[PDB]
Ligand binder design. Structure first.
Ligand SMILES: *[C@@H]1O[C@H](CO[C@@H]2O[C@@H](C)[C@@H](O)[C@@H](O)[C@@H]2O)[C@@H](O[C@@H]2O[C@H](CO)[C@@H](O)[C@H](O)[C@H]2NC(C)=O)[C@H](O)[C@H]1NC(C)=O
Ligand code: NAG
Lengths: 219, 208, 214
C-alpha cells in the first residue's frame, strides 16, 4: 500500500491550506487515516484523524481551523487548514493505521508547504572548482553552490545518480533576503581532474527549474 | 464460579469480579441456576459450543482491542440500565460498550480490529432490539438500522426488530450476544448505524 | 501535549542504549498503544515498535520496547552507525487523539577524525551578477565541535557568514560542515587575501586555507 500527498506548496497568509492523500494498492475502508506535520527542524505534531465512515477528531490546539474529509469513491482523504500563518509552514504527512496497530504503519513521503506572500523563484547554480589544492590524500574537492531559490525544496545529484560516494549535500539555510541557498560537494581523486567529468544535477520543482552544471578545475 | 454464569463473566457483568489474568483454571464449575446471567434479557448465541471450547482452554488474558474513548462521535457511558446495578446505581457490562446517539445523531460505525497477537482472541459483541419506535429514535435516531460483522470465516448481516416484549426486570427490549475466535493476523470488521453493542475487551487464549 | 524525551542520547557502536518517553495517566499510563518511529532527515518516519513492544519486521530485531508507569522506553542493542536518526515516541490518549514526544537525536560515539579543509573562491559566473560567495568546506570530522573563522587580509569577520552541518554519516559517523561568506562584488574586489582557519580536536594546531585574487 502507498500513500501520496498532493496540493500546493505555497499558500498566502490567512488563506486556506488544502491537501489530498491518494491511497494506492488498498482501500480506505475500515482503516483510520491521519494527518501529521513537522515544521523545519522541529518534531512531529499530530493534526487529527478520520475514522469509521466519516467521523473525525482533531488536535485540541488546531481543531477550530482544521477539516479532515474523505472521498471513498476516489480513494482519497483531504486536509483543510484555514487562516494559515508562518507557524503552519511544515512538511505535512498523511498516514494510515488500524486498531491492533494503534499507531501509524504507512506514511506518505511528505509534502512541503510554505506560508508566505513571496513568489516562487528558481536557483542559480555556480561551480565550486577543484584544483591541486589538497587536504588529506583523497584530496580535491568540488561542488556547486545552489543559491537564491524559493520555496523549498531542491534536489541535487551528481552524474545523474551514478556518483554517490563522498558526496555531501548540506541543509539549506534561509538568508536575510528570504531566499534559500545550499551547497553540494564531492571529494574526488586529484590525479584525474583533467579526464573525469563531474556534473551536478539541480532540480527545483516549484519553479520547474532543472539545470546541470559541469564542474572542472578551470585554468 | 460463585454466583455468575459464563456469559456474565465473559461480558463483564458488574456483579462478577473474576478477571485480570485469572489463574490457569483446571476447567470450570458453574451452577445450573446461574444467579446473575445477562444484565438485560436476551440470548447468548451458541452458548453451547463456546462452553465446549472453554473446556479445552486453561488460561485467559483480557486485552483492550478497541478503546472506549475512540467512540467520540457517540455517547458511550449513557447506555446504562437498572437491570444490573454496580452499587445501587444502574450500570452495564464492562467488557462491551452500549453506543447511544450523541446529540440526535448516530454516525455510521465502520471500523476494523486486526489480531496482532500470537494467540487467538475470543471477541464478544451484541445487538439491541428496542421496545418501540420511540425508544429506537430515542436511543439511535435512525429508525432503520443494521449490524455487519466480518472475519475470514464469519459473515453477519443483522437487522434489529422493533417489537414490544414481555418485561423481564422492567425492560421490554432484549440484547443478543455473539462471539467468535479471531486467528492471529486475521481482522474482524464492524459496520453499523445503530443498535450496536461494541467490544472493548477481548481474551487471548491458548488451547491444549 | 508533548511527551518528554531526552533531546539526545549517545553510544559507541556495539553497545546498548535506551531512550525514555514520559507522559501521564491519560496516554502512556492507561493504554498500551505506544509506538516508536525512526526518522532520517528528508524522509518520512518509519514505524519501528508498536503496542509498546511489538516489531513490524526484522529491521526491528535489535529494537526492544517496554513500559513502566507513565514512562516508556526503547532499547537498541548492538548499536550500528546506520542507527543514527531521530526517534519519536507516540501514544494514543483518552481524548481519542495521539500525541508525540519531542524527539531524540541518537549520536554515534566514534574515534576522533580530523577535518579535511577546502576553500573555494567565488566563480566568474556569480561575480557578473553582483555578489561573491566564498565557501569553506570541512569534510569528515568527528566530534561535532569545530570553530571556523574568516579573515580577509587578516581582518577577522563577523556577521557576514552562515554555515550548515550534515547529519552524522550513516557509514563512518562523521560530520561535514560548510561555511559560506557573502560579500558585495564591490567589497570583494577591494581585498586580496581570503583565508579560512579551522580549529578542531583532531588538529594539533589550527589549519588555514587561503587564496589570493579578489
Ligand atoms: C493484519 O495485519 C497483518 C500484519 O500487517 C503487517 O504488519 C503490521 C505490523 C504493519 O506493519 C502492516 O503494515 C503489515 O502489512 C497483515 O498481514 C500481513 O499482510 C501483508 C499484506 O501485504 C503481508 O505482506 C505480510 O506478510 C503479512 N504479515 C503477516 C505476519 O502475516 C494482515 O493482512 C492483516 N489482516 C487483514 C485481514 O488485513
Ligand atoms: C448538536 O448537533 C447539532 C446538529 O443537529 C448542532 O447544531 C449542535 O452544534 C450540536 N450541539 C453540541 C455539539 O453541543
Amino acid at each position: 500500500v502507498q500513500l501520496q500527498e498532493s496540493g500546493p506548496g505555497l499558500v498566502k497568509p490567512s488563506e486556506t491550506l488544502s491537501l489530498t492523500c491518494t491511497v494506492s494498492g488498498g482501500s480506505i475502508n475500515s482503516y483510520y487515516w491521519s494527518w501529521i506535520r513537522q515544521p523545519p527542524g522541529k518534531g512531529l505534531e499530530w493534526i487529527g484523524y478520520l475514522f469509521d465512515s466519516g467521523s473525525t477528531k482533531y488536535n485540541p490546539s488546531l481543531t477550530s481551523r482544521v477539516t479532515i474529509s474523505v472521498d471513498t469513491s476516489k480513494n482519497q482523504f483531504s486536509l483543510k487548514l484555514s487562516s494559515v500563518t508562518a507557524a503552519d509552514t511544515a512538511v505535512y504527512y498523511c498516514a494510515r493505521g488500524f486498531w491492533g496497530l494503534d499507531g501509524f504503519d504507512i506514511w506518505g513521503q511528505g509534502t512541503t508547504v510554505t506560508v508566505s506572500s513571496a513568489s516562487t523563484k528558481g536557483p542559480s547554480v555556480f561551480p565550486l572548482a577543484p584544483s591541486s589544492k589538497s587536504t588529506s590524500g583523497g584530496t580535491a574537492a568540488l561542488g556547486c553552490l545552489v543559491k537564491d531559490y524559493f520555496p523549498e525544496p531542491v534536489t541535487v545529484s551528481w552524474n545523474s545518480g551514478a556518483l554517490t560516494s563522498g558526496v555531501h549535500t548540506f541543509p539549506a539555510v534561509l538568508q536575510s533576503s528570504g531566499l534559500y541557498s545550499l551547497s553540494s560537494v564531492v571529494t574526488v581523486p586529484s590525479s584525474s581532474l583533467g579526464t573525469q567529468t563531474y556534473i551536478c544535477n539541480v532540480n527545483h520543482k516549484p519553479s520547474n527549474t532543472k539545470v546541470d552544471k559541469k564542474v572542472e578545475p578551470k585554468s | 464460579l460463585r454466583d455468575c454464569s459464563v456469559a456474565g463473566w465473559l461480558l463483564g457483568n458488574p456483579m462478577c469480579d473474576e478477571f485480570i489474568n485469572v489463574p490457569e483454571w483446571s476447567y470450570i464449575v458453574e451452577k445450573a441456576n446461574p444467579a446473575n446471567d445477562l444484565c438485560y434479557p436476551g440470548n447468548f448465541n451458541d452458548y453451547e459450543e463456546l462452553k465446549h471450547l472453554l473446556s479445552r482452554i486453561n488460561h485467559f488474558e483480557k486485552i483492550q482491542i478497541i478503546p472506549k474513548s475512540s467512540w467520540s462521535d457517540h455517547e458511550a457511558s449513557s447506555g446504562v440500565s437498572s437491570a444490573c446495578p454496580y452499587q445501587g446505581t444502574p450500570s452495564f457490562f464492562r467488557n462491551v460498550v452500549w453506543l447511544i446517539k450523541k446529540n440526535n445523531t448516530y454516525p455510521t460505525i465502520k471500523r476494523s480490529y486486526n489480531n496482532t497477537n500470537q494467540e487467538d482472541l475470543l471477541i464478544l459483541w451484541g445487538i439491541h432490539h428496542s421496545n418501540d419506535a420511540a425508544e429506537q429514535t430515542k436511543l439511535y435516531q435512525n429508525p432503520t438500522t443494521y449490524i455487519s460483522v466480518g472475519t475470514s470465516t464469519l459473515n453477519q448481516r443483522l437487522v434489529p426488530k422493533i417489537a414490544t416484549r414481555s418485561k423481564v426486570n422492567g425492560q421490554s427490549g432484549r440484547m443478543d450476544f455473539f462471539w467468535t475466535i479471531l486467528k492471529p493476523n486475521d481482522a474482524i470488521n464492524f459496520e453499523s448505524n445503530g443498535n450496536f453493542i461494541a467490544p472493548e475487551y477481548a481474551y487471548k487464549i491458548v488451547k491444549k | 501535549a508533548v511527551l518528554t524525551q531526552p533531546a539526545s542520547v549517545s553510544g559507541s557502536p556495539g553497545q546498548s542504549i535506551t531512550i525514555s518517553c514520559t507522559g501521564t495517566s491519560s496516554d502512556v499510563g492507561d493504554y498500551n498503544y505506544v509506538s516508536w518511529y525512526q526518522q532520517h532527515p528528508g524522509k518520512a518516519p518509519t514505524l519501528m515498535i508498536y503496542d509498546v513492544n511489538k516489531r513490524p519486521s526484522g529491521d526491528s530485531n535489535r529494537f526492544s520496547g517496554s513500559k513502566s508507569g507513565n514512562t516508556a522506553s526503547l532499547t537498541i542493542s548492538g548499536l550500528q552507525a546506520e542507527d543514527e536518526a531521530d526517534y519519536y515516541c507516540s501514544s494514543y490518549t483518552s481524548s481519542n487523539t495521539w500525541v508525540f514526544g519531542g524527539g531524540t537525536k541518537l549520536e554515534i560515539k566514534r574515534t576522533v577524525a580530523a577535518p579535511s579543509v577546502f576553500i573555494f573562491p567565488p566563480s566568474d559566473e556569480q561575480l557578473k551578477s553582483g555578489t561573491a560567495s566564498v565557501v569553506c568546506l570541512l569534510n569528515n570530522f568527528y566530534p561535532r565541535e569545530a570553530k571556523v573563522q574568516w579573515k580577509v587580509d587578516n581582518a577577522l569577520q563577523s556577521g557576514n557568514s552562515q554555515e550548515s552541518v550534515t547529519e552524522q554519516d550513516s557509514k563512518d559517523s562523521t560530520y561535514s560542515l560548510s561555511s559560506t561568506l557573502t560579500l558585495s562584488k564591490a567589497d570583494y574586489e577591494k581585498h586580496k587575501v581570503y583565508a579560512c582557519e579551522v580549529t578542531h580536536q583532531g588538529l594539533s594546531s589550527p589549519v588555514t586555507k587561503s587564496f589570493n585574487r579578489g
